[PDB]
């Protein structure tokens, strides 16, 4: 009766969550003033690539920006002056994820080759050369984040995540338990935990140190493509193909908020938060992005002006600007 | 002015990088891409009559294609291979191949990319038609036991699944001994697709 025991345990978790729930964000934050109309204009246009953009990542200094395109190019941009600092060619053009090291010395790329390539930017020869090629995943790499100058956490399409020591090359720990392909991951501000979303319409909280799953959230009804942490570190947001965003809380272990509209029927490609967490920027399959009031679940604004689908979206560390890359092969910075 | 010496040098470096990117893009645009359907992704390169064809094979990736098929939008054509001998073997696989063809033809992304159909295992199909009648694969088949007639019926059944008759065409051929004929046919189909796309870009057509 192991299945019966699993059903009983699920029922008792559901009962515990229901008893834990006593109020909602709607009736708690209804007595706060709305953020009002949010009108963000484009300030910079980066038009160097020649194919659909698939990933991008900011730098810690909030000025350098790495982007990856399907034409086998990783371009580093100086946001203030619109300058190409570096243009790294890739061995495989099927790139689907990118990352910037917090120290700013390394970049990472990956895709359908099932290999995470780490390139070193600071060399005495003056060029950028590949520093490491981590292999061992049996599926395409969906996301990767630089946990440190020597540790990198990656997520693949084989329902697994891994933590790699770059120097040795082998993965120290492997996180397993997702039924479907893992689409995205998001590190916590203290780096002690992270969260992963997969195609089984569920998200999981992973402890980096112990390599175990702590909590599972199953609010969504379809595959989740985007995930992001609240700047506090006690909540996160997910975007799925059901044209709906959901804000979950780790401490309450349930879903806090739902962002959806009748006129929105397109899937969500990316999600991100503002510096203070009041605004939630979500890029949809529709050519424009949306800005939600994260505390009232009202549409604060829209970022229109893309020819094709918006693929990647990120917010700078100090909240000055928002970078958006689309399938149109243009990068737009908004302020 | 309002620019420092190092800033001007950085601008010059950015211009050089942009020039290199433009030349690489114009070199890459001169190529033709094909997707083959029948550790990662397998690539094959071959040049035929001053045109560079790059064929991508996606077999072995044990993951749902719904999350990565859109990466292959923009290919000139899709090459679909079908084994004629798979009409009786079951692991009924002929109907599974037909369903796969219907899915790839009705895919939202591939609403304009033409399909080139290859039929293999001819020299085995002709011999196999003498022992296993076509009624096993097709309960509604009303015809003789001629292998040419069975091949024609199979081709018609595969072609009639094309709901996007307009803006998408399904060129068809059967495998032969001479590789030159097959590569010439794929070159002709790719050239036709490229010419049609060029016409669509202009005002006419």
């Amino acid at each position, epitope marked *: 009766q192991l299945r019966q025991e699993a059903e009983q345990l699920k029922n008792q978790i559901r009962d515990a969550r229901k008893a834990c729930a006593d109020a909602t964000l709607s009736q708690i934050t209804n007595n706060i003033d709305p953020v009002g109309r949010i009108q963000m204009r484009t300030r910079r246009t980066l038009r160097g690539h020649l194919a659909k953009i698939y990933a991008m990542h900011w730098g810690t200094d909030s000025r350098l920006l790495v982007s990856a395109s399907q034409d086998g190019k990783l371009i580093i941009w100086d946001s203030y002056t619109t300058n190409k600092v570096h243009a790294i060619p890739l061995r495989s053009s099927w790139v689907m994820t990118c990352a910037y090291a917090p120290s700013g010395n390394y970049v990472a790329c990956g895709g359908l080759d099932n290999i995470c390539s780490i390139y070193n930017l600071k060399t005495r*020869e003056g060029n950028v050369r590949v520093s490491r090629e981590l292999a061992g995943h049996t599926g395409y790499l969906s996301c990767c984040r630089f946990l440190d100058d020597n540790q990198i956490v990656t997520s693949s399409g084989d329902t697994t995540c891994a933590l790699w020591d770059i120097e040795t090359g082998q993965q120290t720990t492997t996180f397993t338990g997702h039924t479907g392909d893992v689409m995205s991951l998001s590190l916590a501000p203290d780096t002690r935990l992270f969260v992963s979303g997969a195609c089984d319409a569920s998200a999981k909280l992973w402890d980096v140190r112990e390599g175990m799953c702590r909590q599972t959230f199953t609010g969504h009804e379809s595959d989740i493509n985007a995930i992001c942490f609240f700047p506090n570190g006690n909540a996160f947001a997910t975007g799925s193909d059901d044209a709906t965003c959901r804000l979950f809380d780790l401490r309450a272990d349930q879903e806090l908020m739902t962002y959806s509209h009748d006129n929105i029927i397109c899937g969500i490609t990316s999600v991100s938060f503002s510096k203070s967490g009041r605004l939630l920027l979500a890029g949809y399959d529709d050519f424009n992005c949306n800005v939600w009031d994260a505390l009232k679940a009202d549409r604060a604004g829209v970022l229109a002006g893309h020819d094709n689908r918006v693929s990647c979206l990120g917010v700078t560390d100090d909240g000055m600007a928002v970078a958006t890359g689309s399938w149109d092969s243009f990068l737009k910075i908004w302020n | 002015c309002t620019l420092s010496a190092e800033d001007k040098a950085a601008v010059e470096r950015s211009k*050089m990088i942009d020039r290199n990117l433009r030349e690489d893009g114009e070199k890459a645009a001169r190529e033709v891409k094909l997707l083959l359907l029948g550790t990662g992704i397998v690539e094959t390169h071959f040049t035929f009559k001053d045109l560079h064809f790059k064929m991508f094979d996606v077999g072995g990736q044990r993951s749902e294609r719904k999350k990565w098929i859109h990466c292959f939008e923009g290919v000139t054509a899709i090459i679909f291979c079908v084994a004629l001998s798979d009409y009786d073997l079951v692991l009924n696989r002929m109907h599974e191949s037909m369903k796969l063809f219907d899915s790839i033809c009705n895919n939202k992304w591939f609403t304009d990319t033409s399909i080139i159909l290859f039929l293999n295992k001819k020299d085995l199909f002709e011999e196999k038609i003498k022992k296993s009648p076509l009624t096993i694969c097709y309960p509604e088949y009303a015809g003789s036991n001629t292998y040419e007639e069975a091949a024609a019926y199979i081709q018609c059944q595969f072609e009639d699944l094309n709901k996007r008759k307009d803006t998408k065409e399904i060129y068809t051929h059967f495998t032969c001994a001479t590789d030159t004929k097959n590569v010439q046919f794929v070159f002709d189909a790719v050239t036709d697709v490229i010419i049609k796309n060029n016409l669509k870009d202009c005002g006419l057509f």
Partner: single-chain antibody
Framework: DVQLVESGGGLVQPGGSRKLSCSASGFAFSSFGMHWVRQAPEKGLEWVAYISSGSGTIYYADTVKGRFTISRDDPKNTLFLQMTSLRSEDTAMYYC??????????????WGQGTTLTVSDIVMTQATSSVPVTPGESVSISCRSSKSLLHSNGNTYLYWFLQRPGQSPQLLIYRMSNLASGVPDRFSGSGSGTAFTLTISRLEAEDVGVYYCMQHLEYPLTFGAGTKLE
């Protein structure tokens, strides 16, 4: 191993011509701009000419314009300067210098060995010609500029170099605050407006030499007189 080896220097007569070569190995020569910097027998450093990547931009000093021509050759990794109508003031040791310009880069990082040739504007002032020092004591080297080196972007284009006895100059601080790679953390640089200083803490025997401060705000690059440490 990064290496710039210069050759083609010797004894000439006035009115003659000469060709100096500089072969580069161990780094991507085509991505680096190049400078020629000459030093008189007993004097300071003096900038001569500059060429950019791809030969897009070429600069000469006002005393070598119309007589000196700089050029490079990327497939063979060579950089050569052709000098015509040499005079007695052209006797000096020439240095091949590499410099890469992008955001957050360190120009003037590597210097060549030097080749000796014998023939027979923002003003930077170094306060003290000579300074006697003892090990284990902090020291400060100050120099001043005639025009403010702070640009609108917020960058102070001041560089520090160290010339050891019988050695090529080595970069210490670039843009007045940034410490070069491989340089001990005891070296520091700080300044305001027209005045600047370099602080050395826990001075050891490796700091004996001549310290030069150079401006990069405008391409007529100017070096200081040079402060010697005994």
């Amino acid at each position: 191993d990064v290496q710039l080896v210069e050759s083609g220097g010797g004894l000439v007569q006035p009115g003659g011509s000469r060709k100096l070569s500089c072969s580069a190995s161990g780094f991507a020569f085509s991505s680096f701009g190049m400078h020629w910097v000459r030093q008189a027998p007993e004097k300071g450093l003096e900038w001569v000419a500059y060429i950019s990547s791809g030969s897009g931009t070429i600069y000469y000093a006002d005393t070598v314009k119309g007589r000196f021509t700089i050029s490079r050759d990327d497939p063979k990794n060579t950089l050569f300067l052709q000098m015509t109508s040499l005079r007695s003031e052209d006797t000096a040791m020439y240095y091949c210098v590499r410099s890469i310009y992008y955001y957050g880069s360190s120009p003037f990082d590597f210097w060549g060995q030097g080749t000796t040739l014998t023939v027979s504007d923002i003003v930077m002032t170094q306060a003290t010609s000579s300074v006697p020092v003892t090990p284990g004591e902090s020291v400060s080297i100050s120099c001043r500029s005639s025009k403010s080196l702070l640009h609108s972007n917020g960058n102070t284009y001041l560089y520090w170099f160290l010339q050891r006895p019988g050695q090529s100059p080595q970069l210490l601080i670039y843009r007045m605050s940034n410490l070069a790679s491989g340089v001990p953390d005891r070296f520091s640089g700080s300044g305001s407006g027209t005045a600047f200083t370099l602080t050395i803490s826990r001075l050891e025997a490796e700091d004996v030499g001549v310290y030069y401060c150079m401006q990069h705000l405008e391409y007529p690059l100017t070096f200081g007189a040079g402060t010697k440490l005994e």
